[PDB]
């Protein structure tokens, strides 16, 4: 033996992801003939847990109408869905808004709908996302969104004001150039930059307020306004493939799944 | 000299059981065919008399007390007579024919707590409940019950009848019989349960049917 | 035999489709110096209605003048054809419209002209379809267009009203974000999305309002709008190849085969 | 499986005729230095019901003294009543 033990009652580690694969498929008669021994069994033995089930004589359901998969994460999430919305007032108004994956944070001020039933079905989280905004409203404005890592400093979340931070910062560290009326649209890449390894979905005291964050967008506009018209962002997030899940979770209630 | 083809005239056509002859005969129009699914919206084998015939019937239920004495009569049920019963799934294939031939399958379920004591019987009867010994039942095919080993027994026994099959509309005599005498009485302590739970399931093996008739 | 019977007057299932393909072109006299077997015969036997016709001495036609071939429903249909057209009138308004393929919706609240006629040729219908709409009139509009599959709910259709639809149910499901300056054209697959298999044509009771419809997509629009320019769409309805045709039936009358 | 069942608790059907002739021959000690099994057993289980009996140091009883075999119908009923 490794450790100099024993073990006598047949109980280990349990819940070990990925069991089968989702659609249908075949891999004649599942049971009948032969009497349900997967039945009746015992459920505090997790090797008894592990039998194969049957009560009835029932043979192959057949295939499926779809070739897409859709209960695998990398194609259930292409979708993207909400996670905030702003709207901009006066001149060189800067914006900042984080991504909490706290389930603390209730909507708008954190994750919504979907993001928050999603990034609480898990404790760990690494790898890159999606985000895609949509400009709606005026046109004819020049503004520049950029990334901020965790440590470094930033300005003020959930807060539309005049921005402290200096050009050199900005353009140090990385930022976009475009207007209104050239493209309209960003779909980009949220970097993964943070010296700590991963990131939770449900922590407490000042685990909950830093290990919880990964990342923040924060935007400053220019050329805004004309004659009055509201400039109104989106922000839809999605994902990549270079992202993977750890330690499935028990999902969230029905009461904590606020939606917007 | 080429010769145009005509219709057929005569032919036997029908069914086995519903034959009719016609002077004038048409080719019966068929498009399409028996299309298999790899979807089936369900999951089941389908239906037939094998799985519906072969299903056990809870025929009789009962509740043997402890103040029934020495070889007391608690159920005296008639087998075949209460297969022949709406409420079950072989009227669809009893109510379309008039003489059979099967075989019995009894399954008899009782449930002690083993702080009980006492016995029970079940035998299959043909015939009559005559001048033959309650105390010499153990000739019959049947099922002995106790408070101490186990709780189900099943009972296979097969057609006992004078002619050649059994005539559901207008029996001669009933094939089987069931009865239930008190083989060792119900003895309990103070607190203990003084009642045990009784079931008897009942179903059908190796069926034959014939004589369908259009009336009910 | 399978089922102990017999047959003798000759007659079986009859109208298989597809008997001869309708490009002209070559398999001398056809007929003449042979005697015409196939004039006179007996169309109550259904294999003597199946016997090659002629009356007069013929001859090859030819071949024809468009290697295009005109008579195939996957080259006809590729044309598309009017579905529906709506106009917005003020802020925020959501309009919603099925795909309604049962006869007894006249248009336009349902089957206009082609779309009438064809989608009531046949009994059954299962595949996917292609849309293509044009924005017309007020530009600088920033709306969205979704579908909503059977089952889920929706909002009320051929009703133009305010959304009572959250943006989490809208971004989690699937739409678009455009703007009326970016293209200004959309051509959309409609995905089969129904837990039934197929759909009907002319169907009655609550078996024509569930089981011949199978989908709808509803639009909701915004910064609409300024300096009163109204703003038009019309939808037009075209065809795909991942569809195939069930059970011919005979086609409509002239008088319900109604035009815009 | 025939019908697709199954069973459990042994227990089928029971009473077949003829289970052994009656007039006695020999087919030594018949029980003795090996302990009884068939003694002691489950009477609700038919498969262990059908076990040799004994309860004692038991060995051959021997012949009998007449062919006629006074336990078989047809030469039983043949005396007319």
């Known amino acids: ?260 | 000299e080429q010769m145009i083809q005509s219709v057929d005239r005569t032919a036997v056509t029908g069914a086995s059981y519903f034959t009719s002859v016609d002077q004038s005969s048409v080719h019966t129009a068929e498009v399409g065919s028996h299309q298999i699914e790899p979807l089936k919206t369900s999951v089941d084998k389908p239906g037939s008399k094998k799985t519906q015939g072969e299903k056990f019937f809870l025929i009789h239920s009962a509740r043997w007390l402890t103040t029934h004495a020495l070889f007391h009569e608690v159920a005296k049920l008639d087998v075949v007579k209460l297969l022949y019963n709406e409420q079950f799934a072989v009227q669809g294939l009893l109510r379309y024919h008039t003489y059979a031939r099967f075989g019995i399958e009894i399954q008899v379920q009782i449930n002690p707590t083993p702080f009980q004591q006492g016995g029970l019987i079940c035998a299959m009867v043909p015939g009559d409940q005559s001048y033959g010994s309650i105390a010499s039942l153990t000739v019959y095919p049947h099922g002995l019950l106790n408070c101490n080993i186990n709780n189900v027994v099943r009972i296979k026994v097969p057609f006992i009848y004078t002619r050649g099959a059994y005539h559901f509309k207008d029996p001669q005599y009933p094939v089987w019989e069931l009865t239930i005498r008190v083989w060792s009485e119900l003895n309990i302590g103070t607190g203990t349960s003084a009642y045990t739970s009784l079931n008897v399931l009942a179903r059908f093996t190796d069926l034959e049917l014939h004589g369908l008739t259009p009336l009910s």
């Not at chain 1, 991504?99 to 999603?118: E, Q, V, Y």
């Not at chain 1, 200096?166 to 990385?174: E, P, S, V």
Request: glycine share 6%.
């Open chain 1, 1 to 260: 033996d490794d450790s100099g033990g024993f073990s006598t009652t047949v109980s280990t580690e349990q819940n070990v992801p990925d069991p089968q694969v989702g659609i249908t498929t075949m891999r004649m008669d599942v049971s009948g003939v032969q009497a349900p021994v997967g039945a009746i069994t015992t459920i505090e033995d997790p090797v008894l847990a592990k039998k194969v089930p049957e009560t009835f004589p029932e043979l192959k359901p057949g295939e499926s109408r779809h070739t897409s998969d859709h209960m695998s994460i990398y194609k259930f999430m292409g979708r993207s869905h909400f996670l905030c919305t702003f709207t901009f007032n006066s001149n060189n108004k800067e914006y900042t808004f984080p991504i909490t994956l706290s389930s603390t944070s209730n909507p708008p001020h954190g994750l919504p709908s979907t993001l928050r039933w999603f990034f609480n079905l898990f404790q760990l989280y690494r790898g890159p996302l999606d985000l895609t905004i949509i400009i709606t409203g005026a046109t004819d404005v020049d503004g520049m969104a950029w990334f901020t890592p965790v440590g470094l400093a930033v300005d003020t979340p959930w807060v539309e004001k005049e921005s402290a931070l200096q050009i050199d910062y900005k353009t140090a560290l990385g930022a976009v150039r475009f207007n209104t009326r050239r493209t309209g649209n960003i779909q980009i890449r949220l970097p993964w930059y943070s010296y700590l390894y991963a990131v939770s979905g449900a922590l407490d005291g000042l685990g909950d307020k830093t290990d919880s964050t990964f990342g923040l967008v924060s935007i400053q506009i220019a050329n805004y306004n004309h004659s009055d018209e509201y400039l109104s962002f989106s922000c839809y997030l999605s994902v990549t493939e270079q992202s993977e899940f750890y330690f499935p979770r028990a999902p969230l209630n029905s009461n904590a799944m606020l939606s917007t």
